[PDB]
Amino acid sequence: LVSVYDSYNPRTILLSINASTHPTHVTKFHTQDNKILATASDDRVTRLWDISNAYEPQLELTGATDYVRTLSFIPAAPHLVATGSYDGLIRLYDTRSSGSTPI
Amino acid sequence: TAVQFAKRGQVMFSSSLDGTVRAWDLIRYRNFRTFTGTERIQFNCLAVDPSGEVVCAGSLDNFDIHVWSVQTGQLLDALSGHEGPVSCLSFSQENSVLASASWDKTIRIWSIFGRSQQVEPIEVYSDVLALSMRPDGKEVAVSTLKGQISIFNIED
Amino acid sequence: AVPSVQTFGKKKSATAVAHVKAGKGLIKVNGSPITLVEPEILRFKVYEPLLLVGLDKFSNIDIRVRVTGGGHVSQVYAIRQAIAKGLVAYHQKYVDEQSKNELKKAFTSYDRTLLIADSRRPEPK
Amino acid sequence: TPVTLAKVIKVLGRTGSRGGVTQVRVEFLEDTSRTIVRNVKGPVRENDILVLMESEREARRLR
Amino acid sequence: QKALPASLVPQAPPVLTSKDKITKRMIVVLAMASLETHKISDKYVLLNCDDHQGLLKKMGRDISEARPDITHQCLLTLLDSPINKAGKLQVYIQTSRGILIEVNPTVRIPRTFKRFSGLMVQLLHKLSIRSVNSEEKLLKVIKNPITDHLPTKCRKVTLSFDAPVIRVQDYIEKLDDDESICVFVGAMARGKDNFADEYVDEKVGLSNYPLSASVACSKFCHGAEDAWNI
Amino acid sequence: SLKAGERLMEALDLGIAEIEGLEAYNRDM
Amino acid sequence: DFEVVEEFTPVVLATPIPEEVQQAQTEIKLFNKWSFEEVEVKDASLVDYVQVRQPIFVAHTAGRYANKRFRKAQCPIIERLTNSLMMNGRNNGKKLKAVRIIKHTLDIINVLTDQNPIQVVVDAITNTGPREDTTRVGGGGAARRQAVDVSPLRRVNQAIALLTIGAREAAFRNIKTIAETLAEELINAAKGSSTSYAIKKKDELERVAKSNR
RNA sequence: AACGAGGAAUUCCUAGUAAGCGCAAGUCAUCAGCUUGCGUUGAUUACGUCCCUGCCCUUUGUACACAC
């Protein structure tokens, strides 16, 4: 499970989203947007959580092959999310669409 | 010392220093009742409900707002709670509540109808006298001794 | 001497003595400035008559408040009353009274406790 | 789900009602004509507009 | 295709209680139970319709009302169900005198009738029975009413005779994805089914035929396992 | 039992349903 | 094309007032962070009972607000939320604690959902008001529930009471404190997402009233 | 061994109130196992209704008009 809280404050754990039971390697925030978290896991799925609803994933971004361990956003389009697995096959995903298969 | 009208001008009331408040007709030119106090205190002002049911008057000496019924000449109660003389009184033409101007520097709103019996003070800068109220019945105009004229809202 | 005017404020057992003189635009309470009020959440309740009136009307006046008695909430309410009374008593005496009237109206349109303090008197039914 | 905002025309009195139920004539906001007697539970004064769930029941005495 | 969970050991499901009002769960209430105590003099006994009846005759109550045996075998049937092993229900007891008892889902009920009567006669006077491992007290007497202690998203129905017969499967699947089903059964002998019609809103029946108190909760709970897919 | 206002309502409902009963019957003949 | 110049001398004070205070003299802000402007009650029938027309600095104006009957409608609901946080025996008569909790609460709400924390509170209070409610009938033992409609003041009063208890019951014995769960309860109440306690009582009290009209 | 905020059943309470906090005094009765004052903090919810339970009043309007 991932935990996101305020900077310069260890005392106030603001949010603790429970992801899948696999370990989460990378948890990145959106660059242009400022309210949606994107996390990966060893469960071979990336998830996009809006922090208003920290219990159900807004878009379960699937289709990965093995061990997504680094993902990034693209500063032009907010609908496009880059996703890197651990076997090559650098996925480029769309979240405006259904979001279960790369473009 | 104070003269007021009530109920389409057919009946009319008057307060004097004699210790009485006297109703009058303008059809038969005669008094109906001569309401009095328990010891005949003086009187400053008079006010009437827009319905011809309750008369009230205020005094220099006893400074309790005595109220009478129009039908029964006995006084109902003494609406008290002031320090120094109640100067002016007036009933609201819609909400049917009375406002008391007193030398306590406080404007008192008395809701005396229908199980309420509640007292609301609005305290002002200085010795407030000569109250008046809108025909809408939601505002109170008062004249302080300091010179300024203040305008309030009865409900708020 | 310089022009001066003095007002009083009152919460439950806390009194405030504010003296308003012409000067350099400085604000003082108990020797300390106004940026050091200790309840730390009610510090915007003592800036409150400052920012309703516009800070230009305090740019040439001086305020010195002593406070004794009360606790913390009752003390801060005494300071905001004595500053608001002290500003409106300076402007009725040596400045325009139409300035006083717009100063008084800006307070009573906001809240009546800044001008005169309602004594929370007991009532028997 | 058609909610209907309803201005209170007059809070009634001297009617058979339980404590915490005041019988109130309300009037819809779609037109100024049609008034329906309903029951209001909370502290209600004059001229506050009120949200009705449905708009056809004829609210009788609470007995 | 889909990735497995990282942990595959079997783990104990959480013990649902009145503190938690979130998860989807089953509530069974043995309402109008006949469980009261009286002093023999030197000893304290539970009133029975069979053991001592002339005591009830002096009390003015009828003999046939005080039946704690049917409430005993209702608990043994309900708590030994596989749903209790699956940890998806808790059970309350609403007595005839207004005492409301919360039965925790982990308690090992005494098996014979005489040991259960000994357990309850100290429950009504100490207000709680503690655990042998000193963790958390099993049978806790809680505050009236029952509707505040139910889960928040709540569905209340009762088991009756004149009620329409619907399949137990069809009522559970037509219930929502997070509502907690609360069924208020009659733990008394024979009489009116108006023990908790104030709380529930529709009466629900299971058969046109006469069903006992033990088999009424047993039928619907066995429909709960076949609908919640354990 | 009842209250004034409610007593007139049941009087109003009973008589006019009888009045509208004889009115439609008069239109029948 | 048209100017009204009222300030001529640059306003410099001998006592140094910080610029965070000086820029607050144009718009009166809640806690000097959030503006009361454009905070409009979206759902109807709770205006003049949920009031945000007058702006307030801190939620602490202890006036005469219970002596009259409907004087409670004039309270700003930021202050009505702080005053209603004393729903226990341990936090009675501690408003400086209750104001500091709400200041932390509006901080978390603005960080999470970025429009306005006050606008969320206005939207959250106007959602969870139970628009239909039930009451019993005496009837000589015939105690049947009967649906009755609800005053707008009671809709405000039940909304604030349920949202505060929803914060207090969630952080009863947990790792989260009252400031975190009140932000979670208010944000879920503004969406109407049916996971807050307050929305879960809104449809439950209505459906009980909807079961017997 | 008893004990994780207390059952049924009851009692009190409408604004500087309930509740929380300390300080002082020990007043010809009473009080040290406590009593009485004085300050700090300071709310929710009615503020309507006679539907239930009670309690009382009235049933010639006589106190001068008009109205009823």
From Swiss-Prot, chain A:
Cellular component GO terms held in the UniProt record: 90S preribosome; nucleolus; nucleoplasm; rDNA heterochromatin; small-subunit processome; t-UTP complex
Keywords: Nucleus, Repeat, Ribonucleoprotein, Ribosome biogenesis, rRNA processing, Transcription, WD repeat
Molecular functions (GO terms): U3 snoRNA binding
Protein name: U3 small nucleolar RNA-associated protein 15
Highest rank taxon of the organism: Eukaryota
WD repeat segments: 21-59, 63-103
Classification of source organism: Eukaryota, Fungi, Dikarya, Ascomycota, Saccharomycotina
Full-protein positions shown: 104 to 206 of 513
Description of how the protein assembles with itself and partners: Interacts with snoRNA U3. Interacts with MPP10. Component of the ribosomal small subunit (SSU) processome composed of at least 40 protein subunits and snoRNA U3. In the absence of snoRNA3, forms a complex with other t-UTPs. This complex can associate with pre-18S ribosomal RNAs.
Keyword Nucleus in annotation: yes
Covalent S-S links between cysteines: none
One GO-annotated biological process of the protein: maturation of SSU-rRNA from tricistronic rRNA transcript (SSU-rRNA, 5.8S rRNA, LSU-rRNA)
General remark: Present with 358 molecules/cell in log phase SD medium.
Location(s) in or outside the cell: Nucleus, Nucleolus
Coiled coil: none
Presence of the UniProt keyword Transcription in the record: yes
Function comment: Involved in nucleolar processing of pre-18S ribosomal RNA. Required for optimal pre-ribosomal RNA transcription by RNA polymerase I together with a subset of U3 proteins required for transcription (t-UTPs).
Curated annotation (Swiss-Prot), chain B:
Top-rank taxon: Eukaryota
Residue ranges of WD repeats: 1-34, 38-80, 81-120, 123-156
Protein localization: Nucleus, Nucleolus
Something else known: Present with 16700 molecules/cell in log phase SD medium.
Quaternary assembly: Interacts with snoRNA U3. Interacts with MPP10. Component of the ribosomal small subunit (SSU) processome composed of at least 40 protein subunits and snoRNA U3.
Annotated function: Required for bud-site selection and cell separation. Also involved in nucleolar processing of pre-18S ribosomal RNA.
Family, per entry: Belongs to the WD repeat PWP2 family.
Protein name: Periodic tryptophan protein 2
UniProt organism field: Saccharomyces cerevisiae (strain ATCC 204508 / S288c)
Residues of the full protein shown: 391 to 546 of 923
Swiss-Prot record, chain C:
InterPro entries: Ribosomal_Su5_D2-typ_SF, Ribosomal_uS9, Ribosomal_uS9_CS, Ribsml_uS5_D2-typ_fold_subgr
Record's keyword terms, sorted: Acetylation, Cytoplasm, Isopeptide bond, Phosphoprotein, Ribonucleoprotein, Ribosomal protein, Ubl conjugation
Residues in cross-link Glycyl lysine isopeptide (Lys-Gly) (interchain with G-Cter in ubiquitin): 28, 45, 57
Modified residues (Phosphothreonine): 68
GO biological process, one term: maturation of SSU-rRNA from tricistronic rRNA transcript (SSU-rRNA, 5.8S rRNA, LSU-rRNA)
Entry's Gene Ontology molecular function annotations: RNA binding; structural constituent of ribosome
Residue numbers of Phosphoserine PTMs: 32, 59, 74
Superkingdom of origin organism: Eukaryota
Localization of this protein: Cytoplasm
Gene Ontology terms: cellular component: 90S preribosome; cytosol; cytosolic small ribosomal subunit
Cross-referenced PANTHER family: RIBOSOMAL PROTEIN S16, RIBOSOMAL PROTEIN S9
Note: Present with 33800 molecules/cell in log phase SD medium. There are 2 genes for uS9 in yeast.
Role played: Component of the ribosome, a large ribonucleoprotein complex responsible for the synthesis of proteins in the cell. The small ribosomal subunit (SSU) binds messenger RNAs (mRNAs) and translates the encoded message by selecting cognate aminoacyl-transfer RNA (tRNA) molecules. The large subunit (LSU) contains the ribosomal catalytic site termed the peptidyl transferase center (PTC), which catalyzes the formation of peptide bonds, thereby polymerizing the amino acids delivered by tRNAs into a polypeptide chain.
Stated family: Belongs to the universal ribosomal protein uS9 family.
Protein name: Small ribosomal subunit protein uS9A
Provenance organism: Saccharomyces cerevisiae (strain ATCC 204508 / S288c) (Baker's yeast)
UniProtKB/Swiss-Prot annotation, chain G:
Modified residues (Phosphothreonine): 15
Any GO BP: translation
Signal peptide boundaries: none
A cellular component term, taken from the record's GO annotations: cytosolic small ribosomal subunit
Compartments, record wording: Cytoplasm
A family per Pfam: Ribosomal_S7
Cross-link (Glycyl lysine isopeptide (Lys-Gly) (interchain with G-Cter in ubiquitin)): 33, 191
GO molecular function: mRNA binding; rRNA binding; structural constituent of ribosome
Superkingdom of origin organism: Eukaryota
Main location class: cytoplasm
Keywords: Acetylation, Cytoplasm, Isopeptide bond, Phosphoprotein, Ribonucleoprotein, Ribosomal protein, Ubl conjugation
Modifications the protein undergoes after translation, according to the UniProt entry: N-terminally acetylated by acetyltransferase NatA.
UniProt cross-references to SUPFAM superfamilies, sorted A to Z: Ribosomal protein S7 (SSF47973)
Its biological purpose: Component of the ribosome, a large ribonucleoprotein complex responsible for the synthesis of proteins in the cell. The small ribosomal subunit (SSU) binds messenger RNAs (mRNAs) and translates the encoded message by selecting cognate aminoacyl-transfer RNA (tRNA) molecules. The large subunit (LSU) contains the ribosomal catalytic site termed the peptidyl transferase center (PTC), which catalyzes the formation of peptide bonds, thereby polymerizing the amino acids delivered by tRNAs into a polypeptide chain.
UniProt xrefs under PANTHER family: RIBOSOMAL PROTEIN S7
Subunit details: Component of the small ribosomal subunit (SSU). Mature yeast ribosomes consist of a small (40S) and a large (60S) subunit. The 40S small subunit contains 1 molecule of ribosomal RNA (18S rRNA) and 33 different proteins (encoded by 57 genes). The large 60S subunit contains 3 rRNA molecules (25S, 5.8S and 5S rRNA) and 46 different proteins (encoded by 81 genes).
